[PDB]
Amino acid sequence: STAGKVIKCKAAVLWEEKKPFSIEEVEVAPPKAHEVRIKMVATGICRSDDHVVSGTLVTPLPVIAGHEAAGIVESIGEGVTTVRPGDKVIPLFTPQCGKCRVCKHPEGNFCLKNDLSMPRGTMQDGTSRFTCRGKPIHHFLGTSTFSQYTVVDEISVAKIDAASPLEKVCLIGCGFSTGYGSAVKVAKVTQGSTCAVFGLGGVGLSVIMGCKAAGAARIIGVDINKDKFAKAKEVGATECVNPQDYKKPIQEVLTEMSNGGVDFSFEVIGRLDTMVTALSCCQEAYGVSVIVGVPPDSQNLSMNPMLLLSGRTWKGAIFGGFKSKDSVPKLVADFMAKKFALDPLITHVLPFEKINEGFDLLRSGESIRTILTF
Template identity: 65%
Template sequence: MTTAGNVIKCKAAVAWAPKQPLSIEDIEVAPPKAHEVRVKMVATGICRSDDHVLSGSISSVKFPVILGHEGAGIVESVGPGVRNIKPGDKVITLFQPQCGECRNCLDPKSNMCLKSDIGKHTGMMLDNSSRFTCKGRLIQHFVHTSTFTEYTVLDEMAVAKIQDDAPLDKVCLISCGFSTGYGSALNTAKVKQGSTCAVFGLGGVGLSVVIGCKVAGAAKIIGVDTNSDKFAKAKEVGATECINPKHYKEPIHKVLERLTEGGLDYSFECIGNTSVMASALLSTNYSCGTSVIVGVAPSAAELNLNPMEILTGRTLKGAIFGGWKGRDCVPKLVADFMAKKFELDGLISHRLPLQKINEGFDLLHKGESLRTVLYFC
């Protein structure tokens, strides 16, 4: 029996409140409305941003909510008006959508669609309603995606169609973690050949920055992390050396300044810690260095800097999703992966079924995972 046009009952990991474990629940997923797509999820990654919501650090997100944004799946049905996507297509979810019509989408320098829910956190589809219910209650969406569920509904602008032979359990990382790091090096910093770089935080996003720096031809790529167990993997994907701030008495920016004879060309903060952001900036050359904020800090965090640290010539930048325009660029990134221009396998440390999602978050908290990919039984 076809499911198109009908409510689908399925399993989902529901966050009922912050600072509580996710609960596997039976939910109802309504059919897609005009310009919407319903997707059967195949794989989704656990990202630090999801954990920020669960911990209460991103206080603007409303509960109950279905989190998850780094996903890939197969289109089950489409609503009226959907033109370029059909049932059976493989797709990647886009937490940073691309409507293709707003001022930012039309500007080649921006990928921040004005219809994005990042920062607003309305928790709704574009028509200001939800497609999820559980136990008679409305469930919020998360940044246009909500991938911790067997079926989800997305606005067409938040879906990128990809090639049919792409392995969804790997390319799901292109939905967030890999693209964010990789693009921060290539698009945001525009790392130059022969340059010196440092990457603060060697999780999945940080390692993706390392890969981007290597592809760009950086001569020195220094991994920085307080967990030395991460160094072997960082060197495997392209870091030329790694250092642990705990092993030095002087501030880490002084160490890096000495190692690079006056400061780095580029630094990347991939943690979401404002004190580390300041250190990353100070580690760059005072007259021409560029530092990129990649990590997501808590909502109430503030970055305090002496203006002279930038006045001398440093550049401080940031970018969501590595500067990529989702619907335009994600299919090309998948094609590059299929052409073996970069690898994703080394970024995946664990694979778990949706039912064990809380174990995946525990691994993240303990610093034992790079990326945990959830699959749907």
């Protein structure tokens, strides 16, 4: 009864930076060739969505944000072969076109069809499927999940197990898979190693889960909010440190604690200073440091390249290095088989209409991952 027709529904529109979302009616066009329209069931609030509000992460406005979500296919455009109406799906903020050099490379996952490097805020075809007050509204990362319905390109959606609990597995669309993969795929944490994790939010906790799954002997959580420490320990941290408790810079503290530097460190905050601190705290000859946090737009860090010349490895990654469409269904299958837990990350549940309260909870430091239900 809606296939081929415009859907009027509620969405959370961001009209300008540093303002509350506006919950109001939008028009969602029907899918074009190779597009899929999704009825949203649940979406997480990730710090990257807040970065759009704050101007840390620049993408065109006005916009429908939201990228960590799960829903049910309402209809498919011509030529779609990988999902059908009624299927449970997770939108992919990093596409997997399967055809570019990156998709073909064994390690790479940052598909060249992504809307991160040169943001347009559109569908792959350079147009939008959203109108609000008669005005076109931008998409975000080809997902836009803060809406009762969205339209995504086929390369930006994965079909998942029909018995999946969507109010949990939405986290596989971003924060869990990013943190977990950063440890197990990008860093390749080894048995018996010492790890340091900077930032103990939903992504930082998922890095800890991955370090523990890899068999690290020590996992040192680092956060300036000591309220984050109890849950970090529950999911695997062996110790936690608050830099503001020390007279010395935390790189020196962590080097001392690890008898000369950690094996693996992770920046999971988004600050230039902690990216350099995290590099410095890994062992100078064989340490590895992974940047996960998002830096403020266009800003450069400063660092001494002798930190690398001694033998450190520095890398970053999007989405935990996972090739998104191949990996999301397998991660859902692993969750259904109890291979990792998502409940530790979910501290609050709210209806979609209370989105602004959910962002207030994140900004206050009180939540890890609020899940919004449509």
